[PDB]
């Protein structure tokens, strides 16, 4: 057993039929030493008395908010959560596997620039009693300050007649070096709590590898009796632009003809019912492309 945070603990269990579980001794954080009663969750049933309480934790029915009282007054709280180890593996029932870039991938992170900010999102089929706790750092031996905010619902969709709930969180590196050569990776650690169930997930990466710029800005068409295309860098991309350069790809889409350039403009051939789209990528590093920015042709 170990403490996740104040008055919150985790019990690691080997999850198998008729497993005996672990014996846990809960101590009421209180000065007084007599006339003490324990309870669980909302039930008034007195489970024991005294300074301490011994319990065998083997099923979720044995977990929950253990509370000690003395004269009706609430003295101390102690919440117990369970971490299933199924045949030597921790449980991963909460989050849906994205299977990209590889199996057993639950977290996907991105960054719109080298500023030091980035965003990580994950999916789940759960809708209630769901809580996440996010932490991050650069380096494991000696970690560096990385501040993470709160995880909140970003979208809701249906996939295979079962609802999908997307969560997202924003973080930021305390003292960033946007132009530097990242030597140590970012470490992201997530605690997931569904009811009393405890699970935690992880991801490691450099920022330069997860870059995905925003689509080009102000996409315009200038015809000529065939068409001249022009755009601008996005607002979120890093600055100055002569340092953090971008490259682009122009597509006319029946077929899809594509060209590449480092300029903010290009000339192409337009056709009826066609569409012109453009996306961007870091000019010097092969990171992720940007979503298309489109303008109907003709």
């Amino acid at each position, epitope marked *: 057993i170990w403490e996740l945070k104040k008055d919150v603990y985790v019990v690691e269990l080997d999850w198998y*039929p008729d497993a005996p579980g672990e014996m846990v001794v809960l101590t009421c954080d209180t000065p007084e030493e007599d006339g003490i009663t324990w309870t669980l969750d909302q039930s008034s049933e007195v489970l024991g008395s005294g300074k301490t309480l011994t319990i065998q934790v083997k099923e979720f029915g044995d977990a929950g908010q253990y509370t000690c009282h003395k004269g009706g007054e609430v003295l101390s709280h102690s919440l117990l959560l369970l971490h299933k180890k199924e045949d030597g593996i921790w449980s991963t029932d909460i989050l849906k596997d994205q299977k990209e870039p590889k*199996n*057993k991938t639950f977290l996907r992170c991105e960054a719109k620039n080298y500023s030091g900010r980035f965003t990580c999102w994950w999916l789940t089929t759960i809708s209630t009693d769901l809580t996440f706790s996010v932490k991050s750092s650069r380096g494991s031996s000696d970690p560096q300050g990385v501040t993470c905010g709160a995880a909140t619902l970003s979208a809701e969709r249906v996939r295979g007649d079962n609802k999908e709930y997307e969560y997202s969180v924003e973080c930021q590196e305390d003292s960033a070096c946007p132009a530097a050569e990242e030597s140590l990776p970012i470490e992201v650690m997530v605690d997931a709590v569904h009811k009393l169930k405890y699970e935690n997930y992880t991801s490691s990466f450099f920022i330069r590898d997860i870059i995905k710029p925003d689509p080009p800005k102000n996409l315009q068409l200038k015809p000529l009796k065939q068409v001249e295309v022009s755009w601008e860098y996005p607002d979120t991309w890093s600055t100055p632009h002569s340092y953090f350069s971008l490259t682009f790809c122009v597509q006319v889409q029946e077929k899809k003809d594509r060209v590449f350039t480092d300029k903010t403009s290009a000339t192409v051939i337009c056709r009826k019912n066609a569409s012109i789209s453009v996306r961007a990528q870091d000019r010097y590093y092969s990171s992720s492309w940007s979503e298309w920015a489109s303008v109907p042709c003709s």
Partner: antibody
Amino acid sequence: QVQLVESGGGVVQPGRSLRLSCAASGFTFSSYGMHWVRQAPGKGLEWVAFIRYDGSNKYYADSVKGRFTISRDNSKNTLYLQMNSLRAEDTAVYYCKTHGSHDNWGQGTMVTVSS
Amino acid sequence: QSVLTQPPSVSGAPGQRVTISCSGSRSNIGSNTVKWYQQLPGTAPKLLIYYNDQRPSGVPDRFSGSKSGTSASLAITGLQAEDEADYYCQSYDRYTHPALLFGTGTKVTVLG
């Protein structure tokens, strides 16, 4: 006392279907996952499929993907395995094993695919 | 989509020691644990070792397991006629997570 009992096996021609049943007892069936394992006479073990505690996610071996279908009914404490488009190489004994450290195995039921 | 490598046959006289290897890769044995089973001619497999080296109840102490890097080993100290049987090692792959990886099997034979 944990116990598992397979049923539904027998003989069948190729191409036809068959449904297998593993009756559980002695523990909290709905709180654990379950496997399906087979072994040809005098050969080694080969994993077939697996299903989680809540039936949320199901997994299959690539030699039976799209053909077999696994299911459970926690209300009656049983585990199923629907085998469709059977093939000759599927001839074997089919056990149900629990998922966990101290796992348990049933007696198994024979499945013979032969014209 | 993977298998573990065990020696087909191992042999030894009563009272002697014998070892059974379970070789794999970094994806499976190098990142996961190892189980050992005992299958007697006319029954289903019985669990001998779990989490590499642990012994359940009802399994003597002579059955001792281990794991090193990409390979594991089950040691039977002090043979007996009853120990003559097939043995299988099982583990998982870091990417075919729940799928079970069984070994080739090992026929233990008592001679002398």
